[PDB]
Every structure is written in structure tokens, then in C-alpha cells.
Write a protein that binds this DNA or RNA. Structure first.
Ligand SMILES: [Mg+2]
Ligand SMILES: [Mg+2]
Length: 127
RNA sequence: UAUUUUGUUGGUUUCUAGGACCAUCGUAAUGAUUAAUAGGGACGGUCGGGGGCAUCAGUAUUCAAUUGUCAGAGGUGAAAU
């Protein structure tokens, strides 16, 4: 049968993390980010650097033995936006298209039961 | 109270001066307005994120301990700290 890992795509703004672990989550198999793949440090959040991160993560899942993966897409959460950034779906498309098999897609963004006053003041972040 | 009379005031003075019995020989329809689409109170089943005290839970955040992994991570319009 297939051997499953967990993809654990933290797609924030300003960066994307593709982090395959084992089924327990305690062993890391190729955490690769977008700033490892682009040198402009605004394109870390871009769909392009997510694609190059996810394809090399998929290229290290093979030679280790991971053939299929559960994905855990994940925005910043907490007091932040709760909206996954521009590279989550690009990382998902690349990791699905680069030889791995996918099952059990879920979103795991950390949501409070309202807690911990948001950063920015009362008038907000005014530009 | 006698005002009029008996021995000038004077006690008892008189079927005539009281609230005490009511004593014309004890009568009356005997005597308390509603119940405000005012108010207050009570009662009934309720209703509510009304209040106080105690208690319970939830993730999130921050930090810590253990763990795995390896060059970036944060952050922005772009940066830099
Ligand atoms: Mg602020
Ligand atoms: Mg404006």
C-alpha cells in the first residue's frame, strides 16, 4: 500500500512553508520554504516560490519513501488574518502534480475563542 | 340661675338653669361612593447576554521543557531594524 506523510503547508503572507513530516508529525522530511527558493524577499509569499518549494519537497519525499500525503493547509491564525496566503494553493497544486498521492485535505488554521487583543491599536493600521 | 314674692343677702329655693341617665315613657332605611385601559401590593406560570458571589470550560497568545530537521525567518508598497 501507500506510505503516508503529512504536508503541513503553512501559507502565510510574506512566506510559504512546505513541511512534510511523518504520520506522527515528530519527524521532519524536507521542510523547504519560499525564501530558500527566491532572492527578492517579497516573492517568498508568491505562487512561484511555493511551486519550487513544493516540488523539491516532493522530490525529497521520494528517496525517503513517502508516496502519499495528507495535507494540512494553515494560515497564520491566532489574532492574524485567518486567510491562507498566495502560495498555499500553488504549493498544493505542485505537490499533487509532482508524483505524490493526496488524501485527507484539511485546514488547520489556529482560531481563538475570542482571545488576546489584536496588534494595531484602536484606529488600526492606517497607511 | 330667680329677674317676682316670703324676714334686706343667704343653704333647702322650682313638675323651669347641662354634657352624668340622655330622664319626650329610648327613634331612625341608623352611619363606609366608585373600583380610574390612575397608582401600589399580593398571587400564578414565566421571561431575559439585568446584578453580586462562587464555580466550570474553550481555543488562542506568550513563555518553558522534551523532540525532529536544517538556512533562513520576521516584516513591508519596497525595505531596514
Ligand atoms: Mg502597532
Ligand atoms: Mg487610506
Amino acid at each position: 500500500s501507500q506510505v503516508f506523510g503529512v504536508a503541513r503547508i503553512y501559507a502565510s503572507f510574506n512566506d510559504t512553508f512546505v513541511h512534510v513530516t511523518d504520520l506522527s508529525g515528530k519527524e521532519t522530511i524536507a521542510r523547504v520554504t519560499g525564501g530558500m527558493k527566491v532572492k527578492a524577499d517579497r516573492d517568498e509569499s508568491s505562487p512561484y516560490a511555493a511551486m519550487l518549494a513544493a516540488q523539491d519537497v516532493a522530490a525529497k519525499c521520494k528517496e525517503v519513501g513517502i508516496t502519499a500525503v495528507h495535507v494540512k493547509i494553515r494560515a497564520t491564525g491566532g489574532t492574524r488574518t485567518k486567510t491562507p496566503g498566495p502560495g498555499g494553493q500553488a504549493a498544493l497544486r505542485a505537490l499533487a502534480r509532482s508524483g505524490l498521492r493526496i488524501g485527507r485535505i484539511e485546514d488547520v488554521t489556529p482560531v481563538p475563542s475570542d482571545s488576546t487583543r489584536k496588534k494595531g491599536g484602536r484606529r488600526g493600521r492606517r497607511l
